Antibody, heavy 225, light 220 residues
Framework: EVQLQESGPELVKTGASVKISCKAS????????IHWVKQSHGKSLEWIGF????????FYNQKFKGKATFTVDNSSSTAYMKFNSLTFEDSAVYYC???????????????WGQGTTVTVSSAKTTAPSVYPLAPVCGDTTGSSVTLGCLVKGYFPEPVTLTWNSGSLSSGVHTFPAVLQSDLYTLSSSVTVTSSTWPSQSITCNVAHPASSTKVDKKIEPRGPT | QVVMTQSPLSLPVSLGDQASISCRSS???????????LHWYLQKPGQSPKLLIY???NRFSGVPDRFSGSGSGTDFTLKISRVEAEDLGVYFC??????????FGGGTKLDIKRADAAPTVSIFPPSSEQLTSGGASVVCFLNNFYPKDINVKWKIDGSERQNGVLNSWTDQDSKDSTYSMSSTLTLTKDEYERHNSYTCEATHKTSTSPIVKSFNRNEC
């Protein structure tokens, strides 16, 4: 029944600061260190530092000295990490993890939080352009047909993409967004039987909450010119 | 700083078989007190890392005996017997013999083995709507293939084109254990409408020949 519950995702502007929390439960809070660890997408975990929940003492990895500040609120069983002067390179998932005081200094970090994603960018909110991708013009000779939807040039994540308002869920691949020149691009494919489309409408539905936009693009067969 | 190196980055295994994940440290993890502080964790997407094995071979609370650890000095192995679907995720090692800092391996992601499958390849010219906007993206989907390694090559009027290409890959599918990929070539409308032929070529171990999908702006 040990749990470390971390605060939610953060989107922060270049040069600003953010403070993320780690709330402990199910154990004697003051008998442990809380460590903080960085996980840049597709890289090894990188240890940042620790704070003692017994007496508040801190120790920081020199690479993060000046960047990260640890605190604890003993009364709420909560540890905090504050980050100042955020840069693109600070975009990562940050974990808290506890480490007992009482089983020697070399005991492992034995319970972890679920992680907090921090995204740092100078970009301004930007609605996507949503493009329907119909097959090459011609004759679909196969038993099935693949359609697409391109969602280009938005910020921030996330978007929601559905096909036929969710009624079309099988045969869908919605691809992770890629970030280029401060903006995201995502695509999705859907594959149906050739007797399904174009005889029945297929529409890609895209929502970008941050611009409060909601677009439907029907996939239309291409003309011969 | 003790550097932990893990292999492989991706480990295919069929359900019911034993998986073996290796960790190497840049410096012996035997402490002068006789103990060796090498530990193994499992992380599933979006979930907290979970401690599995500590001090080379000790199973942590609730960890079943299908998990075992071995090794000494700089070389360590995590063995998972009878791999199941709930075992799927990223496994990573860490050391606490030489601290600070605590350091971590780069992780090994389990891959479910299945029958080889060639990708299904589909190419998409720019939409009329994007062309009206002044842009041109050509999209290629390479769907439902196995194993995960694949290469895509773009050609314009027969000539290889690397600039302007952005790729994205799905994680292994939970239904059929295949992988998929999307590749987008973005050009200015001005440059798109100077050329005639556009081609996406997929190279996958399922054929010595690439799967080629092409279109011509000139005619259907």
């Amino acid at each position: 029944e040990v749990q470390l519950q971390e605060s939610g995702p953060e989107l922060v502007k270049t040069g600003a600061s953010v403070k993320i929390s780690c709330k402990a439960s199910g154990y004697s809070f003051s008998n442990y260190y809380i460590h903080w660890v960085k996980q840049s997408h597709g890289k090894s975990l990188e240890w940042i530092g620790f704070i003692s929940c017994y007496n508040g003492a801190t120790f920081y990895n020199q690479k993060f000295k000046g960047k990260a500040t640890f605190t604890v609120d003993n009364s709420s069983s909560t540890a905090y990490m504050k980050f100042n002067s955020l840069t693109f390179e600070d975009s990562a998932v940050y974990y808290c993890a506890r480490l007992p005081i009482q089983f020697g200094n070399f005991y492992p970090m034995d319970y972890w939080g679920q992680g907090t994603t921090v995204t740092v960018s100078s970009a301004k909110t930007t609605a996507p352009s949503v493009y329907p991708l119909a097959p090459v013009c011609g004759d679909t000779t196969g038993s099935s047909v693949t359609l697409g939807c391109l969602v280009k040039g938005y910020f921030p994540e996330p978007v929601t993409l559905t096909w036929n308002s969710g009624s079309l869920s099988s045969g869908v691949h919605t691809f992770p967004a890629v970030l280029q020149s401060d903006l995201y691009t995502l695509s999705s494919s859907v594959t149906v039987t050739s007797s399904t489309w174009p005889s029945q409408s297929i529409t890609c539905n895209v929502a970008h909450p941050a611009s409060s936009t909601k677009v439907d693009k029907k996939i239309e067969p291409r003309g011969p010119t | 700083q003790v550097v932990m190196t893990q292999s492989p980055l991706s480990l295919p295994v069929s359900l019911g078989d034993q998986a073996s994940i290796s960790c190497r440290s840049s410096q012996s993890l035997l402490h002068s007190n006789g103990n060796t502080y090498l530990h193994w964790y499992l992380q599933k997407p979006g979930q907290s890392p979970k401690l599995l094995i500590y001090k080379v071979s000790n199973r942590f609370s609730g960890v079943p005996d299908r998990f075992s650890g071995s090794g000494s000095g700089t070389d360590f192995t995590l063995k998972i017997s009878r791999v199941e679907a709930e075992d799927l995720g990223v496994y990573f090692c860490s050391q606490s013999t030489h601290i600070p800092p605590w350091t971590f391996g780069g992780g090994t992601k389990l891959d479910i083995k299945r029958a080889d499958a060639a990708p299904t390849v589909s190419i998409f010219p720019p939409s009329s709507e994007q062309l009206t906007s002044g842009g041109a993206s050509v999209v290629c989907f390479l769907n439902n293939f196995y194993p995960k390694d694949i290469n895509v090559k773009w050609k314009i009027d027969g000539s290889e084109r690397q600039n302007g290409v952005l790729n994205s890959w799905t994680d292994q599918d939970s239904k059929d254990s295949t992988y998929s990929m999307s590749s987008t070539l973005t050009l200015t409308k001005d440059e798109y409408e100077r050329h005639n032929s556009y081609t996406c070529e997929a190279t996958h171990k399922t054929s010595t020949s690439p799967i080629v999908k092409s279109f011509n702006r000139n005619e259907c």
